[PDB]
Design a protein around this motif. Structure first.
Motif, PDB file in Angstrom:
ATOM      1  N   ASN A 107       0.863  -1.173   0.000  1.00 40.99           N
ATOM      2  CA  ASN A 107       0.000   0.000   0.000  1.00 40.99           C
ATOM      3  C   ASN A 107       0.902   1.226   0.000  1.00 40.99           C
ATOM      4  O   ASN A 107       1.679   1.409   0.951  1.00 40.99           O
ATOM      5  N   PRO A 108       0.869   2.074  -1.031  1.00 38.55           N
ATOM      6  CA  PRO A 108       1.809   3.209  -1.071  1.00 38.55           C
ATOM      7  C   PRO A 108       1.501   4.310  -0.070  1.00 38.55           C
ATOM      8  O   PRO A 108       2.384   5.135   0.198  1.00 38.55           O
ATOM      9  N   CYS A 109       0.293   4.355   0.494  1.00 38.07           N
ATOM     10  CA  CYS A 109      -0.146   5.456   1.356  1.00 38.07           C
ATOM     11  C   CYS A 109      -0.737   4.862   2.634  1.00 38.07           C
ATOM     12  O   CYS A 109      -1.950   4.651   2.726  1.00 38.07           O
ATOM     13  N   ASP A 129       5.391   5.897  -2.772  1.00 40.56           N
ATOM     14  CA  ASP A 129       5.535   6.763  -3.937  1.00 40.56           C
ATOM     15  C   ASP A 129       5.562   8.258  -3.605  1.00 40.56           C
ATOM     16  O   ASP A 129       5.350   9.080  -4.506  1.00 40.56           O
ATOM     17  N   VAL A 163      -4.395  10.633 -10.893  1.00 45.80           N
ATOM     18  CA  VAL A 163      -3.919   9.269 -10.697  1.00 45.80           C
ATOM     19  C   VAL A 163      -3.595   9.096  -9.221  1.00 45.80           C
ATOM     20  O   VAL A 163      -2.821   9.878  -8.654  1.00 45.80           O
ATOM     21  N   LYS A 164      -4.188   8.074  -8.599  1.00 46.36           N
ATOM     22  CA  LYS A 164      -4.040   7.899  -7.157  1.00 46.36           C
ATOM     23  C   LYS A 164      -2.615   7.518  -6.766  1.00 46.36           C
ATOM     24  O   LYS A 164      -2.085   8.031  -5.775  1.00 46.36           O
ATOM     25  N   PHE A 165      -1.976   6.628  -7.524  1.00 48.80           N
ATOM     26  CA  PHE A 165      -0.688   6.077  -7.128  1.00 48.80           C
ATOM     27  C   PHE A 165       0.312   6.164  -8.272  1.00 48.80           C
ATOM     28  O   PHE A 165      -0.053   6.308  -9.441  1.00 48.80           O
ATOM     29  N   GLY A 166       1.589   6.061  -7.911  1.00 47.88           N
ATOM     30  CA  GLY A 166       2.665   5.981  -8.879  1.00 47.88           C
ATOM     31  C   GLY A 166       3.462   7.255  -9.061  1.00 47.88           C
ATOM     32  O   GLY A 166       2.903   8.314  -9.365  1.00 47.88           O
TER      33      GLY A 166
ATOM     34  N   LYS B 294       0.265  14.199  -0.809  1.00 44.17           N
ATOM     35  CA  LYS B 294       1.102  14.401  -1.982  1.00 44.17           C
ATOM     36  C   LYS B 294       0.954  15.839  -2.454  1.00 44.17           C
ATOM     37  O   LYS B 294      -0.142  16.408  -2.407  1.00 44.17           O
ATOM     38  N   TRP B 343      -8.874  11.454  -1.205  1.00 47.39           N
ATOM     39  CA  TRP B 343      -8.886  10.055  -1.601  1.00 47.39           C
ATOM     40  C   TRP B 343      -9.083   9.147  -0.393  1.00 47.39           C
ATOM     41  O   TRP B 343      -8.758   9.510   0.745  1.00 47.39           O
TER      42      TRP B 343
END
Lengths: 404, 409
Positions: A107-109, A129, A163-166, B294, B343
């Motif tokens: 899970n990145p977050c 990320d 984009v949520k991830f990456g 982010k 999110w």
């Protein structure tokens, strides 16, 4: 408890035959609740097929796809890894006896407290990320092995701007240098093409991008050995782009960009590939309306709040199948299929062609293993369908061969 | 604020001069450093009692039957049961829940038009006599499994303007209603009334008038075939918060003259409703923690919180909800606002609560508040990805408990 109860599959019998037998037996007086038939032997076959098609890639089962304890137990007996997104999934996998080195916290977050739980229980490898994630890892899990998740383009995605991830390549360079500043070990790269992939070449591009970030790590002094190619592989044969085409494209790209002599360790995170076709759902027609040429509305005892949430969350299209094989001559009518709830949006199938059916008749939906029960709710008080696990003798022998 | 044992039946006191928002602030201040900052609800049962008082004052001829499906929390059902309202139940589990708290069957309507046979049998076994229907096959099933039931015919309504429409799925036309009444007469099944739903979010109140007129027609239809029609069910759709264009009192202003014109009290009619959202929407406030962040380069922000579309915010898809984030900590008067997205926790790329909004720069560990999260949020949440349901803290002031005592007497 039905969770750990497994039934025998007799020789010459398939999950479909078992389903037909159950339907015939309860036809007189029983309550006709929806139920699943889950063939764990199908999961063993999927693992064999994976070992044959991707010999260099260790599979890490994506628990979120279907967290059934029987599935995780079978895959654990198969010596595969597990991809876990939360504390609950880590607890579930460890409770069955899986050591931490077979777990990736992908899970990145992550919430700080769950990073703390991962550190306390020995789960060392986590993805990331973003820089704030590096801050959180430095505070709560400083000795973790981090895998940098890079962005992959999905042209058919609904929301392409957000984009949520990456991480991008440019952001990846800064993340690697920042991790170097914080004395945090970065050991590899991960990517996810998604289950919406139409061209296998995207995998190649992703692999190429991963190689680039690998080189970047070498520039900053990191030792990069882990390559995670994620998931998205199809879980049934009812798809345009089949598993073997994808693997056929993937294996040369892996050989070209990550040769075995380099020392790289290649893993994947397939979830739907393992379980999609293993589960077949049987629902009962509980109500019926005729609308005047003649069209029909059928109401069944599973819906979008239940197993069919995949219609909205997972962009699934479901094909109803008649349990009783239909003679060709009988006329077909325009029909709609609806869920049990009082919500007007609880519609499984807008328009399809079916012969006239009656209350008490059964409808079957194949390939219902993935992202169906894992996301079901009890809205309106309707309970989750009972799952009946089956396994033949030879399949159990194959599992024993794996346990050794 | 810490729950004592199990949240389900644990209620906390609300001190004089304190509101639900104040309690939320105290809980957040308490967990400022050491505690894990898991998402949680504050549910003011006093707000539900105030809603009941407001209903009694706006619709004096209409008995409310709470739609359990909207929020099935045992605390809510217990408070409303003490209030002596009825309950609208859609399934066997809801009937079990309501009866377990002590509600007799004559305060239950089984208002699902398309019921599984075994659940009809359960309703018959436990004394729930009143059920809705809108189809001939339903008459066949009731004749087989619950022959002594009192049936209420659900009719179609023009709800195209409504936010949530149940017309396509349910509701008999007048033409079909005539045939259904005659068929029920053939099968010796008693039809005692009519029900209708104008939709969860109708924009024009006038629809109710047409619906009421339609009900009158079907009542007359029943009179022709020999039925004694006494029950009128005007369904739900009333707003549950003040953050709506069409307020409750406007709708009731339209409804009461229509009721007097088409169903005068001297006729002997019994009028009930099935409000769910009205009772519970504003009672629940949800607090989520910013668990990740982010920055995207002018400067824009992506915030990740620990509740999502698989959890409480499923109402975004199922209920067509529009959610407004509110800062727990009051913002500085001149501080800059940035374009941001919010999110959910899960690994799904579709788990997005808010596509675009303006917020000052926030940090991990900060709290976000969502008001009016009572309706169709927890009732439909799942544990996808292993993320647990947010803890619910039930609060009630002394005066609110006094009011509940007044209703009980």
């Amino acid at each position: 408890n039905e969770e750990f109860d497994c039934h025998f599959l007799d020789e010459g019998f398939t999950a479909k035959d078992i389903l037909d037998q159950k339907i015939n037996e309860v036809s007189s007086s029983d309550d006709k609740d929806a139920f699943y038939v889950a063939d764990l032997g199908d999961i063993l076959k999927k693992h064999l097929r994976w070992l044959k098609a991707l010999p260099r890639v260790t599979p890490f089962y994506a628990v979120k796809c279907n967290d059934s304890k029987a599935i995780v137990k079978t895959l654990a007996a198969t010596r595969t890894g597990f991809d876990c997104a939360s504390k609950t999934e880590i607890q579930l996998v460890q409770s069955l006896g899986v050591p931490p080195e077979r777990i990736i916290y992908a899970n990145p977050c992550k919430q700080v407290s769950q990073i703390k739980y991962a550190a306390n229980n020995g789960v060392q490898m986590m993805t990331f990320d973003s820089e704030v994630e590096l801050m959180k890892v430095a505070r709560a899990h400083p000795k973790a092995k981090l895998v940098l998740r890079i962005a992959t383009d999905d042209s058919k995605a609904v929301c392409r701007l957000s984009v949520k991830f990456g991480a991008t390549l440019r952001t990846s360079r800064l993340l690697l240098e920042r991790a170097k500043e914080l004395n945090i070990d970065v050991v590899g790269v991960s990517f996810h093409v998604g289950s919406g992939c139409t061209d296998p070449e995207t995998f190649v591009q992703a692999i190429s991008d991963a190689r680039c970030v690998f080189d970047m790590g070498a520039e900053v002094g990191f030792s990069m050995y882990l390559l995670d190619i994620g998931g998205g592989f199809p879980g049934s044969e009812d798809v345009k782009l089949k598993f073997e085409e994808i693997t056929g494209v993937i294996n040369p790209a892996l050989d070209k960009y990550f040769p075995s002599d380099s020392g790289v360790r290649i893993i994947a995170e397939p979830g739907r590939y393992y379980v999609a076709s293993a589960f077949t759902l049987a629902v009962n027609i509980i109500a019926k309306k005729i609308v005047l040429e003649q069209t029909f509305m059928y109401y069944v005892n599973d819906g979008v709040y239940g197993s069919f949430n995949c219609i909205l969350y997972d962009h699934a299209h479901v094909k109803p199948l008649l349990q009783k094989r239909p003679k060709p001559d009988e006329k077909y009518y325009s029909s709609s299929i609806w869920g049990p709830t009082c919500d007007g949006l609880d519609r499984i199938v807008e328009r399809c062609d079916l012969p006239e059916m009656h209350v008490g008749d059964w409808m079957l939906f194949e390939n219902m293993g993935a992202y169906t029960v894992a996301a079901a709710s009890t809205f309106n008080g309707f309970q989750r369908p009972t799952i009946y696990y089956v396994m033949s003798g030879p399949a159990w022998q194959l599992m024993q061969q794996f346990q050794n």
